[PDB]
Write a protein that binds this ligand. Sequence first.
Ligand SMILES: Nc1nc(Nc2ccc(S(N)(=O)=O)cc2)nn1C(=S)Nc1c(F)cccc1F
Length: 268
Amino acid sequence: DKWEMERTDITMKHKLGGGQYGEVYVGVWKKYSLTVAVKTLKEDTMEVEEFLKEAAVMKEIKHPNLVQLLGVCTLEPPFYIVTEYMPYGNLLDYLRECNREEVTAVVLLYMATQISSAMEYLEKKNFIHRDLAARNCLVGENHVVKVADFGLSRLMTGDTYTAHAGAKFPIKWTAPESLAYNTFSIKSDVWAFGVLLWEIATYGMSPYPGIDLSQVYDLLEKGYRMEQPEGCPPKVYELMRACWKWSPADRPSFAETHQAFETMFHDS
Ligand SMILES: Nc1nc(Nc2ccc(S(N)(=O)=O)cc2)nn1C(=S)Nc1c(F)cccc1F
């Protein structure tokens, strides 16, 4: 198809983000003097069909707050997926390092809004993300934020995705039903989005500090939730709490979350 590109066009450099994203690399598409990100299929995956399914979804996504697919190499091994490279790194590190007189509460709201626009678009396309978190959001020029879009899955709304037994999740971002039953949905992404919103509100602190991973389900089941961070507006906390409702059906849609953020700008 039109996405196939020449692998020898790419100069492969180091693993991206010091290896925290697995077999994703920084490369240069030499012709265009362009730095790109390159996900490869290495020893990790005896799962070639899965990698191809991932790429398939990416070919159907175009949004200003989702990482842009540039091409693929799947005419021979090893298979590649090639996206734009975001030069300022991930949102977690960015919040932790930033000057808070520049990254003000106004900018935090802009960040949150852009992420909720991305997720509204995925929701509408019946795609699930499964790893929404500050570490998987990327920063560009002028506080542009883009959500990473490797690892997405098709799943119609009203349907649920069941991860294989022994699949390992980022516990503190994972909805209780996903913890308990390996069951994922757009509403488990909404839950993760509330946790991301707390990461944004705290300038990238670690969630549920001092709580062991073994205790997180029991904490949530008994009705406890992370407290409102100092200076977090009540309306933003209410939204967080809506995302962490026990029943997935009671959690807002991303359409609703995005709207809430738009309204907050006018209410300001
Ligand atoms: N498109 C894109 N650009 C970047 N840039 C980046 C990320 C981290 C860093 S750092 N400061 O070296 O960790 C520097 C640049 N990351 N990146 C995305 S898609 N990374 C990413 C992700 F955020 C989640 C899963 C897989 C991934 F490859």
